[PDB]
Amino acid sequence: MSIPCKWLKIPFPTGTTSIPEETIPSAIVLQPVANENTVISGYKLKDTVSSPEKAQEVNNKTVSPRTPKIIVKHDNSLQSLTIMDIYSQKPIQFDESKVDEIIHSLETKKVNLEKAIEDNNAELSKIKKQKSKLAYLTRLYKENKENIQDYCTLNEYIEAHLFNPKFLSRHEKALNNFKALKSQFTGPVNLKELEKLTDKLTGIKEYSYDFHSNSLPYDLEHDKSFRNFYDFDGLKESIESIIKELEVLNSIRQAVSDKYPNSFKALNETEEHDDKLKFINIIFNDGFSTTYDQQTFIKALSALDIEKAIDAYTNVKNKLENTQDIIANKEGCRNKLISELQTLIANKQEPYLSANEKLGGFYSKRKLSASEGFHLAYQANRRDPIKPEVIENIITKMKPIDEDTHLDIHIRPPDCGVFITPEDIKKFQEAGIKVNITIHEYKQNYTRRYLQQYTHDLMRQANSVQFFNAEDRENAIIAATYGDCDKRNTTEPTGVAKKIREVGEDFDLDKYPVQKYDLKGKSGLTVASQKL
Ligand SMILES: [Cl-]
Numbered sequence: 160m161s162i163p164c165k166w167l168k169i170p171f172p173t174g175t176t177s178i179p180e181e182t183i184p185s186a187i188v189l190q191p192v193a194n195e196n197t198v199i200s201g202y203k204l205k206d207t208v209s210s211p212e213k214a215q216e217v218n219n220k221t222v223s224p225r226t227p228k229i230i231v232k233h234d235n236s237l238q239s240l241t242i243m244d245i246y247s248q249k250p251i252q253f254d255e256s257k258v259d260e261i262i263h264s265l266e267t268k269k270v271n272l273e274k275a276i277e278d279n280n281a282e283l284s285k286i287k288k289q290k291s292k293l294a295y296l297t298r299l300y301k302e303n304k305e306n307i308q309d310y311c312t313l314n315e316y317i318e319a320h321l322f323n324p325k326f327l328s329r330h331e332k333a334l335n336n337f338k339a340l341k342s343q344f345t346g347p348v349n350l351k352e353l354e355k356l357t358d359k360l361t362g363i364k365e366y367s368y369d370f371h372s373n374s375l376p377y378d379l380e381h382d383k384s385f386r387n388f389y390d391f392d393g394l395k396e397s398i399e400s401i402i403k404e405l406e407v408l409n410s411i412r413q414a415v416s417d418k419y420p421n422s423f424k425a426l427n428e429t430e431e432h433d434d435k436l437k438f439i440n441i442i443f444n445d446g447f448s449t450t451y452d453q454q455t456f457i458k459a460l461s462a463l464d465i466e467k468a469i470d471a472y473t474n475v476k477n478k479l480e481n482t483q484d485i486i487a488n489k490e491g492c493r494n495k496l497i498s499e500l501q502t503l504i505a506n507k508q509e510p511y512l513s514a515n516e517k518l519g520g521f522y523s524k525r526k527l528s529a530s531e532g533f534h535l536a537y538q539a540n541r542r543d544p545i546k547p548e549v550i551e552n553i554i555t556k557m558k559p560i561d562e563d564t565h566l567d568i569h570i571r572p573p574d575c576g577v578f579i580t581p582e583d584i585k586k587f588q589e590a591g592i593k594v595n596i597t598i599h600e601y602k603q604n605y606t607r608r609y610l611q612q613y614t615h616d617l618m619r620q621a622n623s624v625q626f627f628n629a630e631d632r633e634n635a636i637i638a639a640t641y642g643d644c645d646k647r648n649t650t651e652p653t654g655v656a657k658k659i660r661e662v663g664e665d666f667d668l669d670k671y672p673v674q675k676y677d678l679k680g681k682s683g684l685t686v687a688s689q690k691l
Contacts, residue, residue: 160557161567161690164575164599170548172213175202178231178350183549185221185540186578192225192536193573193610195529197363199354201229204238211238219250220542223535224527227357229348237348240340244361245527247371247520248505248535255344258337264310264373265334271310272319275299283320293388296320312374312519313390322385329375332367336360363527371504371520379485379497380523386486395479397517398472405469405510408459411451415460418446426460435461462510472514475499497523530609530669537613541580550586560591567690570617571599572610581620588622596621597690601631608644608671615639615673624682632682639678644671 171177177184177200184200191198202214211230218228222241230238241252279299286292300307300316307316318326336359343353358364369376377385416423422442429435439460443453462468475496478485484492500522504515540546557564566587568579584594596617604610615638618624626632637651638644646654647661647668658664 160565162569162577162579164569164571167576169552170545172202172217172545174206174209174211175204175214175230177201178203178229183540183543183545184228185226185536185543185546188226189533189536189540189578190573193529193533193607195225195532197225197227197354197358199227199229199350199357201231203231203235204233207233209233215239215241215252217544219252220544221539222250223532223539224248224361224363225532226536226539227353227361229353231348235347237344237353240343240353240357242357242361243535244366244370244520245525245531246362246366246369246501246504247515248507249371251370253340255341258341258344261337261368261373262334262341265330265337268310268315269330271305271307272315274305275307275316276320276323278304279320289321289388292321293317297390312372313393314377314385314388315375317388317390318377318385321388325382325385326375329367332365333375336367362524363532366521366524369519369521371515372518374519376521378521378523379493391479391482391485394518395476398476398479401514401517402469402472402476404514405465405472407455408462408510409465409469411456411459412462412465414447414450415442458509458513463508465510468510468514471499471503475503501525528669529607530671533609534612537580540578541582546580546582547586550583554587554590554592557590557592562591564592565595566592567595567597568617568621569597569599569690570614572604572613579617581616584617584620593622594620595623595625597625597627597685598631598635599627601626601635602628611635611638611644612671612673615644615676615678618678618682619674619676622681624678625685626682627685627687629684632684636678636682638671638673639676642673642675644673645669 169181179187179200182200184202188198188200201218202211204211204214209232214230218230218239218241222228222243224243224245227243228241232238239252239254241250243250279296283292283296286295296317297313300313311319315326318329336356339356340360343349343356355364360366360368366376368374377389379386379389382389412423419442422438426435426438426442429438436457439457440453442460443451443456447456459465478492478496478499481489481492483489485496486493488494500518503511504518504520504522506512506515554560557566568584569575570579584596587594598614598618601611601614604614615635618635618639626635637646641649641651641654643649645668647658648654648670655664658666658668662668
């Protein structure tokens, strides 16, 4: 059999139908995301006893910045909206009551700050130097009178006092946005409006509220006057407290490595997370039950190279050994600080995940590339929890499976009827089916090389690959041999010469990495007539 691209002609989470009708919402959003559009989708409760926890879990697993997810109740009023911003890249879920909580905290933030404004107005104006005001207001903040810390960050405290106009604008952008979001929960769910606002919450079009720390974002690059007033010492402290946690966990790993030399090998050759955890708990109970805190023990054994983590966090703390260099941006000091912090916040794997609790989520704004936006939606589709049932149905309608059942899958991203993933292919292979990928286009995606990476993902997992065009095949083979879809990023001399000719040897081109594999040995040319 075969899966056609264009020549074409279930299922849903229990209690629901899809939005749009009869789709896999995570699959059908990929063409528009591939063209850089934010697209909402999700599931609908057909009844009123209907429990949303099944759909909500599919929404959590498949949301990305370009693919916000909604649950709609039976009356077609908005039940919950899930988003993911581009800084922390975490599912964020709103029902109407959690939106109210956010509006309320933004309100008590404003009154509790106005209160401290007056309070300090007398003594504050006795201080002439801005810096002395700062050192003073910073002392007050730490003294935490009337629990002001409950309602504002130190940066918010400082700004509201010393740059009150700027602070009031910043504050209003956040509150207006969440007022706007409240509206969307009354009446019928408005799809295109939910989309344009999501862009205003995720950071694609704007970022006015840091979900991670639930506070107002301060931009180390573009908040230029505030740069000298930014809490560099706090940040530097949290990084040092993170580094301390990382040393505890790493010394737990030493203890385990000592008492159970084989188990680090064993634990790290175990595929699934749920199986890794079972083994971690067995090691804990065998010889550390009375020694360590169990939840800390688990974090330590779950972490992926704490050495590398300790290193990356130390690297940022080192940039904080000189505040004035950062204020000055001493040869990229600040560019590098911002870049490395953004990388750390966006790491959702422990130890980073738990360490980043100590840190704010936002440091400077950034544009989401088409490539990254696509890849986050693509990964969400690879995670989709209903995708397994879909593939099962196809496999059922193929049984019996001889020891020579074949499946030919036609690929022309992103415009085919079904969106195939490497997991899909693997499931077929587990069912006894060999999978051939027929590639309709490759070189033509040179302006959107994330679709070329997607194609390598499938060609790598497939049993075999056919091309209609020799230039497609040889360029793909070259990318699978040198490790990047853009020859200008490779060691290949004509590639380097092309870089130098077009952007200069040193320019920092966008990367399209491809894990190297033997494309040549598993592919060939065919002719369309053989498919017809
Ligand atoms: Cl190409």
